[PDB]
Design a protein around this ligand. Structure first.
Ligand SMILES: CCCSc1c(F)c(F)c(S(N)(=O)=O)c(F)c1F
Ligand SMILES: CCCSc1c(F)c(F)c(S(N)(=O)=O)c(F)c1F
Ligand SMILES: [Zn+2]
Length: 257
C-alpha cells in the first residue's frame, strides 16, 4: 500500500493515483511575492463554538480527531468560499526533525508540522459525496513552529500514547479546536487537492499566515506514534508529509497586505 517510505512514498503514488501528476495538486510552495492581494476576499468565518469532538484515531498515516458532523455545528464560511463547509476532522503532518514536516512551504520555508482542519461543502449532503466534487472540501491549514507550548494542544498530546499503533482509537470528547488557532486569520488561498491518496482535486486550500507555537516536547510526542499496527515491527510515524507540487497555472490569493 501507499505510505511515506522510499518504497511507497510520494514519488510512487502516481502509479495507483494518476491524478498525482494533475493540474491542481497540493501542497505547493507559497511564493509570498507572487501571491496577489485580493481586496474582494471576505474575512474567514470560523464558527467552532458548538464543535463536538468524538474520537481520536491513528489511521496508519497520521492521527485525526473526528467531529460529529451530523448537524450544522462547527462551520467555516466566507473568505473564498461559496456556501457553508462543515468541520469533519482535523489532523497533522510532521517531521522527524524540527526543520521539516509541513506540507505547504512559505518562500520555501518548511515548518515542523502542519495542522489541517477538514471541512465539507454542505450543498453535497455528506462528506463521501463532497470529496468527489471539485469544490467539495475546504481545508484550513495552520503551520506549527517549535517554541513555546500550545496549551490547547496538550489534551491531544496526552492521549497519543493510547493510540500508538495503526487502527487504535480513543474517545475524545469536549475538545475545543479553537485552542489550536493563531491570533490572526490572515490567509492565502488557492485551488488544490487532497495531499494523500486518492489525491482528488476537491480542495479549496486556506492556509493561515501566522503559525502557532508548539513545544519541542509536544512535537516529540507526535514522533512516538507508529505507522505500523500492534504486534508488527516498529516504524516511527515521522515525515508523513507530501513535498510541494508544481503550481501549474494557478494563482495564490492573499487576504492581506
Ligand atoms: C510490497 C508492499 C509495497 S508495494 C506498493 C508500492 F510499492 C507502491 F508504490 C504503492 S502506491 N502507488 O500506492 O504507493 C502500493 F500501493 C504498493 F502496494
Ligand atoms: C484521504 C481522504 C480521507 S482523510 C483526509 C482528508 F480528508 C484530507 F483532506 C486530507 S488533507 N492533507 O488534504 O487535508 C488528508 F490528509 C486526509 F487524510
Ligand atoms: Zn493533511
Amino acid at each position: 500500500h501507499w505510505g511515506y517510505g522510499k518504497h511507497n512514498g510520494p514519488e510512487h503514488w502516481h502509479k495507483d493515483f494518476p491524478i498525482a501528476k494533475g493540474e491542481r495538486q497540493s501542497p505547493v510552495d507559497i511564493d509570498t511575492h507572487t501571491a496577489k492581494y485580493d481586496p474582494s476576499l471576505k474575512p474567514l468565518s470560523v464558527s467552532y463554538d458548538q464543535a463536538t469532538s468524538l474520537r481520536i484515531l491513528n489511521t496508519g498515516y497520521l492521527f485525526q480527531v473526528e467531529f460529529d458532523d451530523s448537524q450544522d455545528k462547527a462551520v467555516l464560511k466566507g473568505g473564498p468560499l461559496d456556501g457553508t463547509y462543515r468541520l469533519k476532522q482535523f489532523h497533522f503532518h510532521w517531521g522527524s526533525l524540527d526543520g521539516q514536516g509541513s506540507e505547504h512551504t512559505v518562500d520555501k520555508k518548511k515548518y515542523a508540522a502542519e495542522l489541517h482542519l477538514v471541512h465539507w461543502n454542505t450543498k453535497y449532503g455528506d462528506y463521501g459525496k463532497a470529496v468527489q466534487q471539485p469544490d467539495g472540501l475546504a481545508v484550513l491549514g495552520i503551520f506549527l513552529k517549535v517554541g513555546s507550548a500550545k496549551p490547547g494542544l496538550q489534551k491531544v498530546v496526552d492521549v497519543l500514547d493510547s493510540i500508538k499503533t495503526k487502527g487504535k482509537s480513543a474517545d475524545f470528547t469536549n475538545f475545543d479546536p479553537r485552542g489550536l488557532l493563531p491570533e490572526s486569520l490572515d490567509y492565502w488561498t488557492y485551488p488544490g487537492s487532497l495531499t494523500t491518496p486518492p489525491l482528488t482535486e476537491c480542495v479549496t486550500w486556506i492556509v493561515l499566515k501566522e503559525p502557532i507555537s508548539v513545544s519541542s516536547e509536544q512535537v516529540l510526542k507526535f514522533r512516538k506514534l507508529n505507522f505500523n499496527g500492534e504486534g508488527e515491527p516498529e516504524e516511527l510515524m515521522v515525515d508523513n508529509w507530501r513535498p510541494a507540487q508544481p503550481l501549474k497555472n494557478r494563482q495564490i490569493k492573499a487576504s492581506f497586505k
